[PDB]
Design a binder for this molecule. Structure first.
Ligand SMILES: Nc1nc2c(ncn2[C@@H]2O[C@H](COP(=O)(O)OP(=O)(O)CP(=O)(O)O)[C@@H](O)[C@H]2O)c(=O)[nH]1
Ligand SMILES: Nc1nc2c(ncn2[C@@H]2O[C@H](COP(=O)(O)OP(=O)(O)CP(=O)(O)O)[C@@H](O)[C@H]2O)c(=O)[nH]1
Ligand SMILES: [Mg+2]
Ligand SMILES: [Mg+2]
Lengths: 282, 277
């Protein structure tokens, strides 16, 4: 398993190496089923490829793995395309980082000349509205707080009025955290979506999320139609395999990376960098 | 036959976030037991990797069956709650207040999160709902000084328990971890024998990074217990296996909702049954 260009990749080389790759992906928290598909994808791509002069069979397979991973994660950075009017939803599991991400997005775009409006739609978590209200003050962006029991139609009414009177062109709706299997709440999210009509629905996923990332992404996507993702808490040391799991089942772009607890802690997501991270290059 | 069952079991454990290391160690042992009905031997084994206090486990092995459960009780009067951002620290404290107030205890809370927006007001609101006093300060107040004041108030008023909330922090930030140690030192300054309990909060949906979190917080403040939240979801909380096996920290409670009563004492049997579906 350590010789220079003296043969094409054999099925015997793609059994010893990919077994280690499968383990690395699992340790990185990439979902099991996603890992088998990825390994079998590499097996097909590498199957019987030439191992030039220089390069060992291992190196060629490792290169194939990294390239496949980079591609599966998005290839190159990609940010949302904004139009005259934009209304986005931040959705996801309890504690993923939605409220903070909404404030980060507001600051990021305000700096780009947009005029954002933050909408605190979480009325179940104690002090949730105060939380976004405070962040709004910190980033210098208006915050509309939904009232207890307010209907989707009423929310739409007030959001429309405020956006018009204050010339807002990017409305960020921060929703409460909910389990992807909570029928009542997932139904409420779907109804809010049909009434408000978001141009983007972003699933905020914690980088430390484990094997269930797959089911979580699929449920939110099938119930409310995810258009993109935000991977938070990347300033931690979690490998971030949940990102590949979410990408694999939704096919949607991972727009941003959350890299700190501060409002400025937002940046474009780079497939290349997470690929290395998942493989343990950092 | 058995090889298909072991293969099935491996997938089930991995899907539950148990990890490769622990999963292989479990299957290797079960395969060596010669037991015909795996799964059951596995359940028996797991109901062992979910309890370091030892004795109750040994009793079932000697053909005995002594039980009692008995409401979980803090060793002392102060409980320091720690964990990374978003896991459920604040809400778990509210639930612990409800749990112990139902047992007749006089409970007080310390809104130690003076860092995050509404971090303290959130706990204050829970205290109001539960008629539990909450010591809090303006955002930016020194958490250690607040904790010290909280312990002093608890002693002066004759309260039985004080739960100290802390701001969320990633285990990879040495400065924030030092702050946590400062909070523990402030508590001991107000009462030399405290805190008797330091409980880590873990989100059931967390993958293998959960082991690193547990290791780092344990190294920083010496954990005496762990609470796993959000088990009402689809995640099984399997990372607890490697954690309890490597750190020997007991699981105290499980969080199963966002209501004041959505807390249950940890039950090894039920947990393992759910983990294996
Ligand atoms: N280090 C770090 N912390 C983050 C990041 N994003 C959010 N946080 C922190 O994580 C916790 C996540 O909070 P939050 O924005 O309140 O989560 P949520 O998804 O809104 C919460 P909920 O589901 O109850 O409505 C907060 O303590 C916050 O400061 C990030 O990228 N890095
Ligand atoms: N479904 C469910 N949600 C839970 C559970 N425990 C907490 N939550 C929810 O998770 C989020 C966790 O919030 P919280 O108690 O604020 O977390 P934290 O660790 O204090 C947050 P921070 O690090 O910012 O200070 C809240 O929306 C809360 O209602 C649980 O057992 N089940
Ligand atoms: Mg929120
Ligand atoms: Mg908190």
């Amino acid at each position: 398993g350590r010789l220079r260009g003296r043969g094409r990749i054999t099925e015997e080389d793609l059994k010893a190496t990919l077994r280690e790759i499968r383990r690395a992906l699992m340790d990185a928290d990439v979902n099991l089923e996603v890992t088998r598909d990825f390994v079998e994808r590499v097996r097909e791509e590498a199957l019987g490829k030439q191992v030039l002069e220089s390069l060992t069979p291992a190196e060629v397979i490792l290169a194939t793995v990294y390239e496949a991973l980079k591609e599966a994660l998005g290839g190159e950075a990609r940010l949302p395309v904004l139009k005259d009017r934009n209304l986005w939803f931040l959705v996801g599991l309890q504690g993923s980082g939605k409220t903070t991400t909404a404030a980060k997005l507001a600051l990021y775009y305000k700096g780009k000349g947009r005029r954002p409006l933050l909408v605190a739609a979480d009325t179940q978590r104690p002090a949730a509205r105060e939380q976004l209200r405070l962040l709004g003050e910190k980033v210098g962006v208006p915050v509309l707080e939904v009232m207890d029991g307010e209907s989707p139609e009423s929310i739409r009414r007030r959001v429309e009025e405020k956006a018009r009177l204050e010339a807002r062109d990017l409305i960020l709706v921060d929703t409460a955290g909910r389990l992807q299997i909570d029928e009542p709440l997932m139904g409420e999210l779907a109804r809010l979506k049909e009434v408000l009509g978001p141009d983007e629905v972003l699933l905020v996923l914690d980088a430390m999320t484990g094997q269930e990332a797959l089911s979580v992404a699929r449920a939110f996507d099938e119930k409310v139609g995810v258009t993109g993702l935000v991977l938070t808490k990347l300033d931690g040391d979690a490998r971030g395999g949940a990102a590949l799991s979410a990408r694999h089942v939704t096919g949607k772009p991972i727009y941003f990376a959350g890299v700190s607890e501060k409002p400025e802690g937002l940046e474009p997501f780079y497939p290349e960098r997470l690929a290395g991270r998942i493989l343990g290059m950092g | 036959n058995l090889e298909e069952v072991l293969e099935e079991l491996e997938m089930a454990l991995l899907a539950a976030d148990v990890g490769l290391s622990a999963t292989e160690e479990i299957l290797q042992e079960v395969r060596a037991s010669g037991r015909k009905d795996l799964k059951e031997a596995v359940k028996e084994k797991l109901v062992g990797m979910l309890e370091p206090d030892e004795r109750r486990a040994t009793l079932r092995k000697l053909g005995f069956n002594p039980q009692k459960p008995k409401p979980v009780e803090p060793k002392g009067r102060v409980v320091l709650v720690v964990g990374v951002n978003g896991v459920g620290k604040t809400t778990t404290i509210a639930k612990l207040g409800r749990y112990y107030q139902n047992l007749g205890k006089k409970v007080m809370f310390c809104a130690g999160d003076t860092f995050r927006a509404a971090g303290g007001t959130q706990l204050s609101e829970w205290g109001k709902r539960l008629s539990i006093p909450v010591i809090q300060g303006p955002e930016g107040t020194d958490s250690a000084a607040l904790a010290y004041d909280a312990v002093q108030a608890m002693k002066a008023r004759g309260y039985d328990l004080l739960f100290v909330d802390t701001a969320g922090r990633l285990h990879t930030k040495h400065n924030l971890m030092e702050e946590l140690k400062k909070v523990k030192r402030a508590i001991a300054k107000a009462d030399p024998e405290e805190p008797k309990e330091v409980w880590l909060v873990l989100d059931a949906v967390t993958g293998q990074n959960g082991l690193e979190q547990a290791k780092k917080f344990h190294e920083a403040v010496g954990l005496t217990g762990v609470i796993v939240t959000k088990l009402d979801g689809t995640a099984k909380g399997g990372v607890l296996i490697p954690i309890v096996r490597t750190l020997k920290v007991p699981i105290k409670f499980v969080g199963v909702g966002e209501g004041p009563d959505d807390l249950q004492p940890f039950d090894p049997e039920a947990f393992v049954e759910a983990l294996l579906e």
